[PDB]
Amino acid sequence: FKRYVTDRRLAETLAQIYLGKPSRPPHLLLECNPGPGILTQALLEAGAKVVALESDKTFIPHLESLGKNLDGKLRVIHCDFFKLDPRSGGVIKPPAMSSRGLFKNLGIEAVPWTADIPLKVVGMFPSRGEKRALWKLAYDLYSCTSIYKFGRIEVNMFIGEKEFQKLMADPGNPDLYHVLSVIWQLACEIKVLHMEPWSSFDIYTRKGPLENPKRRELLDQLQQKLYLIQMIPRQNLFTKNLTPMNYNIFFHLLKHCFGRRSATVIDHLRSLTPLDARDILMQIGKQEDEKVVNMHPQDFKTLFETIERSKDCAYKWLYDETLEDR
Amino acid sequence: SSVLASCPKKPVSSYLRFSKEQLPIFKAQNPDAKTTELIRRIAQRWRELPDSKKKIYQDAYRAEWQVYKEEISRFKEQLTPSQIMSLEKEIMDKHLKRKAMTKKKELTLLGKPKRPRSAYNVYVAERFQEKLKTVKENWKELYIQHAKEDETRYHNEMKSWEEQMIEVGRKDLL
Amino acid sequence: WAKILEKDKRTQQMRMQRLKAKLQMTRRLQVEPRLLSKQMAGCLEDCTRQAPESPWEEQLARLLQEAPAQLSGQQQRLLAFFKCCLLTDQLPLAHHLLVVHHGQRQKRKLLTLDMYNAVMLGWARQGAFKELVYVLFMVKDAGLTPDLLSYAAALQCMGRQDQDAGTIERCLEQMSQEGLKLQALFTAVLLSEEDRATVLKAVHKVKPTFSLPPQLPPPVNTSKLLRDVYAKDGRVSYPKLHLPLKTLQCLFEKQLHMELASRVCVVSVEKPTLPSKEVKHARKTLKTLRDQWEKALCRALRETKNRLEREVYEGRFSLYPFLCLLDEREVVRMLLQVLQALPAQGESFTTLARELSARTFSRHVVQRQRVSGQVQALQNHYRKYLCLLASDAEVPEPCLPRQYWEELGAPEALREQPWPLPVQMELGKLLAEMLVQATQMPCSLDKPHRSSRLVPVLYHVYSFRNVQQIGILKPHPAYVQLLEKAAEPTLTFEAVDVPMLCPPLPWTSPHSGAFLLSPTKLMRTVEGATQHQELLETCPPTALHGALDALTQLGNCAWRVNGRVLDLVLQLFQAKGCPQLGVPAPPSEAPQKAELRRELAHCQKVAREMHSLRAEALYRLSLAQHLRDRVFWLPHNMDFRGRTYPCPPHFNHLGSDVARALLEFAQGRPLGPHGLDWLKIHLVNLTGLKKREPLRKRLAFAEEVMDDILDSADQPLTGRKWWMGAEEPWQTLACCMEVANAVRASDPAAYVSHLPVHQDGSCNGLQHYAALGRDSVGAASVNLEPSDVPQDVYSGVAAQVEVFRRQDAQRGMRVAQVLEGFITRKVVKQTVMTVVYGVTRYGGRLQIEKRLRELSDFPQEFVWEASHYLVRQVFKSLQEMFSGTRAIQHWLTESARLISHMGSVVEWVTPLGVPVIQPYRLDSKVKQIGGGIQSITYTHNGDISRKPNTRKQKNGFPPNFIHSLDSSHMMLTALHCYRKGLTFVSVHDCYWTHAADVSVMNQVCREQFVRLHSEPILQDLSRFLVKRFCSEPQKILEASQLKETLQAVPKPGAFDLEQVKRSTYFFS
DNA sequence: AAATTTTATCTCCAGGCGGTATGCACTTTTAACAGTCACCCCCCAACTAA
DNA sequence: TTAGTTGGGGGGTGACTGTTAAAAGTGCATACCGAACAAAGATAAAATTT
Ligand SMILES: Nc1nc2c(ncn2[C@@H]2O[C@H](COP(=O)(O)OP(=O)(O)OP(=O)(O)O)[C@@H](O)[C@H]2O)c(=O)[nH]1
Ligand SMILES: [Mg+2]
């Protein structure tokens, strides 16, 4: 269920947070699902440049009227951020688009990885499908595909409380530690910028704004905490051993290491690789008996890099394309 | 260790207190009475003992149980963890020692024949800590033949041993 | 030596002490039970202390003189343990486990009467009275009444011991008193012929005139449809083989040797690599590794046996007797043969566990038959039964093979019973873990002595699909590279996966038939399921004769391979390959930053797709070349609805064009006066160009293209290649060769032909529906009425869809414009075929999408919109074409939905007599098996407690009924074709025969269709459903609704079925 | 009992996820004190067959 | 590589026979988690909720 913002003071606060960047504050702010456009109105008043991506056609004509005579600052585009670059291969229907086509239409040029941040994207995560959108973006980021082909795109979008706690789990908190937290902590630098209860936001469904008072009282029991979190892709994410070609093996290693949580690293290493587990564990700087839930993400990266860097063995992994779709 | 004796003892059972009540009297009753006979007499008394005494003993046992549980709850809190780790290591050491003792005794009970004696040991027996120092200082025939006899005699004892182990099913011992 | 003297005295004292303590109160088996009841314990005490040699027999008499749902998993395992201990001849272990379980309060409740009876029988076979009395005391203590088998065990014990008749007359006079009948004693299933002989001797000692019931003449079926087949009055010409008796006996001996071996070796058909140094080194390393693995497996098996025996000795269940069933060498060879054929990609843990247990059972059954002594009986019986199927030999009176097999004197047939599913899975898991742990290999095979560390051959790796994870066993890459390098020339097949070399054994009962030694299921289902077998075995024995005879007749058809077609196929396979024709290409001819990864992924996908097709083709071609100059037979069995399928999987007549091209009949029949015409018409039908023209025009077109036929027959690959353009290329080439040989001969009428000719039925399901409803329009539409030119619905559907598409594209929408000429019969065939079976629009789209995907000329980017358009228009065309068919479908669906609502599954009986049942139930729970490596999750089949699934029962009822009526017709047609001397094999709706007998087979088909559908199938179904389900008045209102639905069948139309006899294109 | 939510989608040719946590019911084991006798381990040398 | 062997001493504890009650062990059962990404559109019965 879409949860567009309506409040004005909250809009001003969010505009101040978004445009608080010191170097050239008005970045081209791609906004996902502005809906009624109070947030984009505040952003435009604060001097920024906004391109609106609507999945819903009805908000398109309304938003253009707000943008009339705004000196080309507002450019409405009918596109969905999480539907970018479908992997099916047919003709691309209007609700979806293409990253290359959109970025050429807007005139944004590709920028190398080592250079500074080209763009910034704001919006909100899907209400029910946060898991799916974190995985899709992670595959896009690790493979340098979709939008991340054009540099290091900034993403600042509200996320739920439970998924925020799952994403920021650590070895100190083992019950929530898992693969997604590891990959997202290795890939980016996540910080918290603002907090807001569900009551501040209002939910718009297909029928319209929620006019039910009984559901509103029922929604009162459904309060949670929405965290505004900011992701910046890390400059040194990619190394010689960890390349956009080898991310599948690392993903399989991470998914295998949490298949049986209460087990030492040696037990998983014996299955995954034919090499000597003792030697690798000694090289990375760990004791013989070390549980996987006590392993920091950088330790996982060091383990994978150490295994891949070995040159004596002609066969270093057992993972193969056959293990996919089976 | 210090923590071992520091750990409190559990309350003694009701029948044990009943036995302790009449144990000194039964000792004076018959000087020739032994521990087993006295225990069986006390067991017979418990067979003929009334139930009101059992109930009052059980109430006292509850009182001692609350006292003991409160005391051990207090004691378990104030201890340092390092002595706890030492105590747990030493209790598993004690358990392993108990298991080894039981294994050794089971082996002795299963008719274990004597191992080949050494000549140096026969010399010590013939000569008859100081004793060890003296025999070592003197250290710096018949036993060999006896050991040769032991080799000729104990080897078929192993061969003789196997059939009983087969009959009693202890094949894994072989 | 004072010390030695003391040692001897102490050892003597310790020995005496230990002896006394062991004698009164260590790993010692327990015999005397521990009895709970005070009276029973005192009785046993006084019995044991009464005499040094207690009077066990009269106490046995006195013990039974006074006579004062589904089993759980643990009970199922214990019963299997106790039954297996008898076969293995380990009785003390079973007795010890029984006393231990009887000892404790909780584990006493587990034991039931059957376990006591089994141990009692086991002790009786040895004639031991003391242990028998102990078990009787046990069963009396448990509070149970001895049954007939308990008396049988005692009688067998007395007979074997040859003890005085007094206890015997006392026992029989009681057996009369209690109400047990001595006649029921000799018909118990759980008895052997030796035990029956012994109890018969024991009874004969007391009663001299005791006579077993006299044997009866075999019954004969008297059903309305099968009366003509089994009539003893008439003229019969039964077919005979073309081989002498001695040749058939030699072939039977060869097949027996092959089945006893359990393995066969086939020389690989790959291009033989040049034997360089590399190949020799690889083969040497492979041999050394195989020897080391053999020794390691032997040691591991011995250690596991010791551990399991020790576990049993502590009073708990384990798999020790099951491991004792087979010899060590056979198990080791089975385990080494499994490893040799493991694919490089890997195999699942559960699949390996299932396969390993299934292979163990078959070898156990074969070994039991060999040891018991039934192989000699089979060898004596078959050599006499083979006089019926020999050219030189003669029989006093011709008859069906099953009738002669029975009349000759049937050998006593007993077969082992399947193990419980938990035992099967546990044994498979144990063997898989042993295989994984035992095998090891050097780290660096290519580099000699680079390092001495050892790594496992097989690894356990998780595979994740969506959220779910699956365990997978995968070989080490170096081992796969070594296997590829070695290029060994031998392939290995299982005995039951290779066509038989001798005539198949006649089917005589649901437990006999097909392969001579190995067990074959009459109905192919999952291992756990047993409902179909129960329904088959609970019916009058004479009802199944039609099905058994049809299966036996289909089994006895001699085959042979085609030389020229096989030679041409081998030429393309060994070289670069021809993918267009159907011969897979060698992997060598492969296509071979994110862009680089995408290219590599595409190439890898192509290679992976090619590598499986090449392996399957390799297996089929190796099997085909091994049978180049031999005559082989293929046995047949049914699915759970009646359709008949061959048993050998790889090489049979149900596969693709290559498989059907490589086969031909082994008996030659002269073409006669009307054979060349049928050969030419078959050629035109295989070509597929003239699919909508009368027979005359097809024959004329065959005459017109004679030049191309004679060119393609003489020079197959270097000529004009006209045969490549046919719909079936390979079969067309063989027909061309046969036609050329026929015409070039001096007398075409005298030429013998060994080539089968196919006759197919058009829209068979709709034909059966129209016959059931006796609709006139429907029958006229599907060629059930006389006509001059063939008629088909699927072409009319395409014409209507094309008209709508043209009118739509006139308005100019893109998708309707794209598909200008892609509206064909093939794209709209399977949808209109399955609308009457209840296909959904979601389903219809996934059929049209799949059909449009493979066109290769249609732009492969508009499929998503083309499928959605085509299915809307097909359903917009199909609203009002079928009426009676849809009425019958609605009645059947409603009846199955309401039957499934009451909590019972749907059942019906085929017109021939075979009973059918639908096994759809909701799966409430799945079991798990904890173990060393991983916990296997497996489905428990056969759980009848779960509720039925209304959605599956309602959707599967319309198709299964029609398919059953489809197979009843073939079996009638086959049975009545046999009497006229024809050769008949079938592929569901297509019937094959020699080129000369097509007219006779057509007449028989047209007659038996009318005979089958003259009976009131629908009314009989309604009556059976009313009697079976509505009989119980427990729920009055629901049963009333069910009866109202069941007693309303659709009314028939006005169509005389006699016109089918005069329809030319009903089967063509 | 009606409504809303969720789910499967014509059939046959023999197929199914794995790990961790908490709970219940019943059997098995262990420490509580008695006193006296017996047995084994040290104490440190010496050495020897598994 | 190490437990077992003989001497004079010493030390700790095993047995015994006894009931009692707490603590551990064993087999079965149910529930929740992973939500490896990857467009879209269709229809009515099963499934859960108030
Ligand atoms: N339910 C169902 N039945 C099928 C399916 N495919 C084939 N059949 C049955 O098999 C029978 C013969 O099918 P085919 O020989 O392939 O085609 P056809 O229906 O006979 O029509 P023609 O190709 O002209 O002979 C049909 O009558 C169907 O009853 C299917 O996919 N689903
Ligand atoms: Mg057909």
Side-chain angles (χ1 to χ4, degrees), chain C residues 641 643 691 760-769 792 794 825-826 829-830 833-838 847 958-960 962-963 966 987-990:
Chain C
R641 307 158 306 143
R643 268 147 87 99
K691 275 173 54 64
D760 191 295
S762 64
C763 320
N764 206 29
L766 284 88
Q767 283 181 341
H768 281 296
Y769 263 115
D792 52 345
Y794 310 164
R825 188 183 187 268
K826 189 56 65 184
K829 173 180 177 178
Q830 206 200 0
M833 181 205 318
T834 63
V835 289
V836 293
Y837 299 135
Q847 296 168 347
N960 296 354
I962 304 302
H963 291 207
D966 178 27
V987 185
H988 299 141
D989 76 320
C990 197

Side-chain angles (χ1 to χ4, degrees), chain B residues 37-38 40-48 50-52 55-59:
Chain B
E37 171 180 352
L38 282 195
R40 294 183 181 277
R41 226 189 291 270
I42 297 169
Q44 283 302 359
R45 283 182 91 52
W46 190 268
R47 314 311 201 61
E48 38 176 44
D51 53 356
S52 53
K55 266 167 282 298
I56 67 154
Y57 293 10
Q58 192 194 41
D59 291 331

Side-chain angles (χ1 to χ4, degrees), chain C residues 591-784 786-853 855-856 858-859:
Chain C
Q592 66 198 334
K593 198 57 192 169
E595 315 141 2
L596 316 178
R597 170 200 47 87
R598 197 191 316 108
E599 182 180 3
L600 292 173
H602 186 68
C603 300
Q604 289 157 7
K605 184 187 177 304
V606 169
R608 292 194 309 270
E609 194 36 69
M610 293 180 12
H611 203 296
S612 165
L613 302 179
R614 189 165 183 83
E616 162 46 10
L618 192 67
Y619 272 133
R620 294 210 309 258
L621 269 303
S622 312
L623 250 185
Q625 209 205 12
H626 174 86
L627 302 161
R628 204 185 178 101
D629 289 321
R630 313 189 195 188
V631 193
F632 54 94
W633 284 263
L634 305 157
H636 280 59
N637 73 12
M638 331 185 278
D639 62 341
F640 84 93
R641 307 158 306 143
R643 268 147 87 99
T644 59
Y645 297 92
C647 282
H650 308 292
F651 199 19
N652 58 49
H653 59 281
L654 283 215
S656 59
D657 301 344
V658 196
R660 295 178 180 177
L662 291 182
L663 299 169
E664 72 177 8
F665 283 148
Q667 277 206 38
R669 205 74 53 93
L671 271 177
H674 273 257
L676 199 49
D677 295 349
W678 278 117
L679 277 181
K680 293 178 184 171
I681 298 180
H682 190 224
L683 189 45
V684 171
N685 283 342
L686 281 174
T687 318
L689 305 179
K690 307 307 187 65
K691 275 173 54 64
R692 281 220 56 180
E693 315 267 340
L695 288 176
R696 330 177 303 261
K697 283 193 180 58
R698 307 182 192 180
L699 182 66
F701 170 78
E703 304 280 1
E704 241 182 26
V705 296
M706 211 37 174
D707 310 341
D708 292 353
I709 294 169
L710 292 167
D711 184 28
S712 310
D714 295 350
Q715 289 195 356
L717 277 85
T718 75
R720 243 164 296 170
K721 315 176 201 63
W722 172 79
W723 61 273
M724 312 207 146
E727 201 206 10
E728 291 76 332
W730 291 110
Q731 311 178 31
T732 301
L733 180 65
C735 190
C736 282
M737 286 162 193
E738 203 90 354
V739 173
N741 293 355
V743 286
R744 292 176 195 273
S746 60
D747 191 19
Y751 178 73
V752 311
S753 70
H754 299 240
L755 185 98
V757 163
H758 316 163
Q759 288 287 282
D760 191 295
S762 64
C763 320
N764 206 29
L766 284 88
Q767 283 181 341
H768 281 296
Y769 263 115
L772 277 179
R774 274 167 204 86
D775 172 14
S776 45
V777 191
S781 182
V782 285
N783 278 325
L784 244 55
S787 54
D788 293 351
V789 165
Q791 294 184 330
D792 52 345
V793 196
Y794 310 164
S795 293
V797 181
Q800 194 65 237
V801 166
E802 213 289 317
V803 158
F804 291 152
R805 175 221 81 91
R806 190 180 35 84
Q807 291 189 359
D808 178 36
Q810 144 184 317
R811 299 161 193 176
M813 81 185 298
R814 184 81 191 121
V815 55
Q817 141 172 16
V818 169
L819 288 146
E820 199 62 35
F822 303 72
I823 313 296
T824 299
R825 188 183 187 268
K826 189 56 65 184
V827 317
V828 293
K829 173 180 177 178
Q830 206 200 0
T831 305
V832 305
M833 181 205 318
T834 63
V835 289
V836 293
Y837 299 135
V839 70
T840 58
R841 285 183 169 89
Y842 173 88
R845 199 202 69 87
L846 266 65
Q847 296 168 347
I848 295 207
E849 181 189 11
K850 179 186 301 297
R851 201 59 60 231
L852 283 175
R853 191 157 305 272
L855 264 182
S856 306
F858 175 80

